[PDB]
CSV table of C-alpha atoms and ligand atoms in Angstrom, one decimal:
chain,number,residue,atom,x,y,z
A,1,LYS,CA,0.0,0.0,0.0
A,2,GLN,CA,0.9,3.6,-0.7
A,3,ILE,CA,1.0,5.7,2.5
A,4,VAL,CA,-0.3,9.3,2.5
A,5,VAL,CA,0.8,11.2,5.5
A,6,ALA,CA,-1.0,14.3,7.0
A,7,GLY,CA,-0.1,16.8,9.7
A,8,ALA,CA,-2.1,18.0,12.7
A,9,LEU,CA,-0.3,21.3,13.4
A,10,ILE,CA,-1.4,22.7,16.7
A,11,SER,CA,0.0,26.1,17.6
A,12,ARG,CA,-0.9,28.6,20.3
A,13,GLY,CA,-3.8,26.3,21.1
A,14,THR,CA,-5.4,26.1,17.7
A,15,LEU,CA,-5.3,23.6,14.8
A,16,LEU,CA,-4.3,24.4,11.2
A,17,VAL,CA,-6.7,23.2,8.6
A,18,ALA,CA,-6.3,23.5,4.8
A,19,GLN,CA,-8.9,23.9,2.2
A,20,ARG,CA,-8.2,21.9,-1.0
A,21,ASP,CA,-8.3,23.4,-4.4
A,22,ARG,CA,-8.4,20.1,-6.4
A,23,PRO,CA,-9.7,17.8,-7.8
A,24,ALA,CA,-13.2,19.2,-8.3
A,25,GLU,CA,-14.7,16.6,-5.9
A,26,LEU,CA,-12.6,17.8,-3.0
A,27,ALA,CA,-12.0,21.5,-4.0
A,28,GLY,CA,-13.6,23.6,-1.2
A,29,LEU,CA,-13.3,20.9,1.4
A,30,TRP,CA,-11.0,20.9,4.4
A,31,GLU,CA,-8.1,18.6,5.2
A,32,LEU,CA,-5.0,18.0,7.3
A,33,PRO,CA,-2.3,18.9,4.8
A,34,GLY,CA,0.3,16.3,3.6
A,35,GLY,CA,1.0,13.9,0.8
A,36,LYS,CA,2.4,10.6,-0.4
A,37,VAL,CA,5.4,9.0,1.1
A,38,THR,CA,7.9,8.3,-1.7
A,39,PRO,CA,9.8,4.9,-1.5
A,40,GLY,CA,13.0,5.5,0.5
A,41,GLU,CA,11.5,8.2,2.7
A,42,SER,CA,10.4,7.9,6.3
A,43,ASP,CA,7.0,9.2,7.2
A,44,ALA,CA,8.7,12.0,9.0
A,45,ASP,CA,10.8,13.0,6.0
A,46,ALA,CA,7.8,12.9,3.7
A,47,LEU,CA,5.5,14.9,5.9
A,48,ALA,CA,8.1,17.6,6.7
A,49,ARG,CA,8.8,17.8,3.0
A,50,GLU,CA,5.1,18.2,2.0
A,51,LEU,CA,4.4,20.8,4.6
A,52,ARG,CA,7.5,22.8,3.7
A,53,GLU,CA,6.4,22.8,0.0
A,54,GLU,CA,2.6,23.3,0.7
A,55,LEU,CA,2.8,25.7,3.6
A,56,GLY,CA,6.3,27.3,3.8
A,57,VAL,CA,7.0,26.0,7.3
A,58,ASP,CA,9.6,23.7,9.0
A,59,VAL,CA,7.8,21.3,11.4
A,60,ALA,CA,8.9,18.6,13.7
A,61,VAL,CA,6.9,15.4,13.3
A,62,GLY,CA,5.6,13.8,16.5
A,63,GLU,CA,3.2,11.1,17.7
A,64,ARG,CA,0.4,9.6,15.5
A,65,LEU,CA,-2.9,11.3,15.8
A,66,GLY,CA,-5.8,8.9,15.5
A,67,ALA,CA,-5.9,5.7,13.4
A,68,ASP,CA,-5.1,4.9,9.9
A,69,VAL,CA,-7.8,5.6,7.3
A,70,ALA,CA,-8.2,3.3,4.3
A,71,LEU,CA,-8.6,5.5,1.3
A,72,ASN,CA,-8.9,2.6,-1.0
A,73,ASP,CA,-7.4,-0.8,-1.4
A,74,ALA,CA,-4.4,1.1,-2.8
A,75,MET,CA,-3.7,3.8,-0.3
A,76,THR,CA,-3.7,4.4,3.5
A,77,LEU,CA,-3.9,7.8,5.1
A,78,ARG,CA,-2.1,8.5,8.5
A,79,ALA,CA,-2.1,11.6,10.6
A,80,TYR,CA,0.8,12.8,12.8
A,81,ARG,CA,1.0,15.6,15.4
A,82,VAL,CA,3.4,18.2,14.1
A,83,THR,CA,4.8,21.4,15.7
A,84,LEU,CA,6.2,24.5,14.3
A,85,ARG,CA,10.0,25.0,14.1
A,86,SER,CA,10.1,28.0,11.8
A,87,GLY,CA,7.9,29.9,9.3
A,88,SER,CA,4.3,31.0,9.2
A,89,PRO,CA,1.9,28.9,7.1
A,90,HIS,CA,0.6,30.2,3.8
A,91,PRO,CA,-1.6,28.5,1.2
A,92,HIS,CA,0.8,27.9,-1.6
A,93,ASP,CA,-1.2,24.9,-2.9
A,94,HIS,CA,-4.5,25.2,-1.1
A,95,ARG,CA,-7.5,27.6,-1.5
A,96,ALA,CA,-7.2,28.8,2.1
A,97,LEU,CA,-5.9,28.0,5.6
A,98,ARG,CA,-7.7,28.4,8.9
A,99,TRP,CA,-6.7,28.1,12.6
A,100,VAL,CA,-9.5,26.4,14.4
A,101,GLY,CA,-10.4,25.6,18.0
A,102,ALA,CA,-12.1,22.5,19.4
A,103,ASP,CA,-15.6,24.0,19.1
A,104,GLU,CA,-15.1,24.5,15.3
A,105,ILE,CA,-13.7,21.1,14.3
A,106,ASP,CA,-17.0,19.2,13.9
A,107,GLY,CA,-18.6,22.1,11.8
A,108,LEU,CA,-15.9,22.2,9.1
A,109,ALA,CA,-16.7,20.8,5.7
A,110,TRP,CA,-14.0,18.0,5.9
A,111,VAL,CA,-12.9,15.9,3.0
A,112,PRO,CA,-14.6,12.6,3.7
A,113,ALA,CA,-11.4,10.6,4.6
A,114,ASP,CA,-10.2,13.2,7.2
A,115,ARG,CA,-13.6,13.5,8.8
A,116,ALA,CA,-12.8,10.2,10.7
A,117,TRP,CA,-10.3,12.2,12.8
A,118,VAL,CA,-12.8,14.7,14.1
A,119,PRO,CA,-13.1,13.1,17.6
A,120,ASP,CA,-9.3,12.8,17.8
A,121,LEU,CA,-8.8,16.4,16.9
A,122,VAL,CA,-11.5,17.6,19.3
A,123,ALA,CA,-9.7,15.6,22.1
A,124,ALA,CA,-6.3,17.0,21.1
A,125,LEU,CA,-7.7,20.5,21.5
A,126,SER,CA,-9.4,19.8,24.7
B,1,DCM,N1,-5.4,14.8,4.3
B,1,DCM,C1,-5.6,14.2,3.1
B,1,DCM,C2,-4.6,14.2,2.1
B,1,DCM,C3,-4.9,13.5,1.0
B,1,DCM,N2,-6.1,12.8,0.8
B,1,DCM,C4,-6.3,12.1,-0.4
B,1,DCM,C5,-6.5,12.8,-1.7
B,1,DCM,C6,-6.0,11.9,-2.8
B,1,DCM,O1,-7.0,10.9,-3.0
B,1,DCM,C7,-4.8,11.2,-2.1
B,1,DCM,C8,-3.5,11.8,-2.4
B,1,DCM,O2,-3.6,13.2,-2.1
B,1,DCM,P1,-3.1,14.3,-3.2
B,1,DCM,O3,-4.1,14.2,-4.4
B,1,DCM,O4,-3.1,15.6,-2.5
B,1,DCM,O5,-1.7,13.8,-3.6
B,1,DCM,O6,-5.1,11.3,-0.6
B,1,DCM,C9,-7.0,12.9,1.8
B,1,DCM,O7,-8.1,12.3,1.6
B,1,DCM,N3,-6.8,13.6,2.9
């Protein structure tokens, strides 16, 4: 299986979420940002790489957040806690970014796969 890694960046008590711009089925919906692990990379390497490219930040990759999500037979999606080392996030690849609190997480129009993590994210912010 192909692994897709995603980051739950919590800073100053809020969670960063990212609004996809593609493909049409997901454009406008919100996600934890990340991307595919390439063969030869660790999960930490891949996630830090993706968030540097997508957001313009250097992060440290920490513990898993929640369980794996099966995207299909082909791919699996995994979230990690990440924390900021340097930089301020900007939507280089996404439509928008938002910092959200616990109360806002269940109301967000999540991409269907990431929605599974709602209870985990609420707990992390509580
Ligand atoms: N937090 C994320 C990141 C990605 N994906 C999905 C969208 C694609 O089906 C696949 C690979 O993502 P991308 O198209 O961004 O490379 O993973 C997802 O559901 N949730």
